Known about the structure:
Blueprint lengths: L7 E2 L4 E5 L2 H8 L3 E5 L9 H9 L3 H13 L7 E5 L6 E5 L12 H7 L6 E4 L11 H11 L3 E6 L2 H9 L3
Parallel strand pairs: 2-7, 3-5, 6-7
Antiparallel strand pairs: 1-2, 4-5
Helix pairs in contact: 4-5
Bound molecules: the ligand O=C(O)C[C@@H](NC(=O)c1ncnc2[nH]ccc12)c1ccc(Br)cc1.
PDB class: viral protein
Keywords: Macrodomain, ADP-ribose, SARS-CoV-2, fragment-based drug discovery, viral protein
Assembly: monomeric
Amino acid sequence: VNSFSGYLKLTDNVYIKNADIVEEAKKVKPTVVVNAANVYLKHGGGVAGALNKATNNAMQVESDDYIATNGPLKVGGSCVLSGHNLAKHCLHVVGPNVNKGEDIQLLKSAYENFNQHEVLLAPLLSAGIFGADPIHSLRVCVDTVRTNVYLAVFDKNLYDKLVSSFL
Ligand SMILES: O=C(O)C[C@@H](NC(=O)c1ncnc2[nH]ccc12)c1ccc(Br)cc1
């Protein structure tokens, strides 16, 4: 039993809710919140910009030190950093950004990072400003993630479309 409330169940292990991931994290304080990161951990906009704003830029400060030490992530890769005031940990996951020409096949690799964590709050990878089809992102998620994932879809209209078209 966990504290996630109001989600629709899609599969044995995948759940979905129309919610602002920022407000959801502040309420549940999950062990892991997933960030829709880029390889430079520059959290300027989208989910990353919103999460970082909610940490009062502490996420960005920590991320800049991470990059200075380790260099950029790989597309499809991830790193675990602090969750600041939002979660115990933030799993920064880099899905391919279609608006940069990155191979959409890397989306499965990106979701595989979720399997290293028993329970996660997460956005749809490569959705929104990353330019991929969110229906496809949900499909890859369901077919790749085996751990318990609670998906927050900010857009109500997109949420309804995702549910109504889910196979
Ligand atoms: O509309 C959607 O769900 C898709 C969209 N989501 C969010 O920007 C989002 N999601 C949840 N809480 C949030 N608070 C503030 C934004 C936000 C998205 C964009 C870029 C990438 Br890459 C991946 C997904």
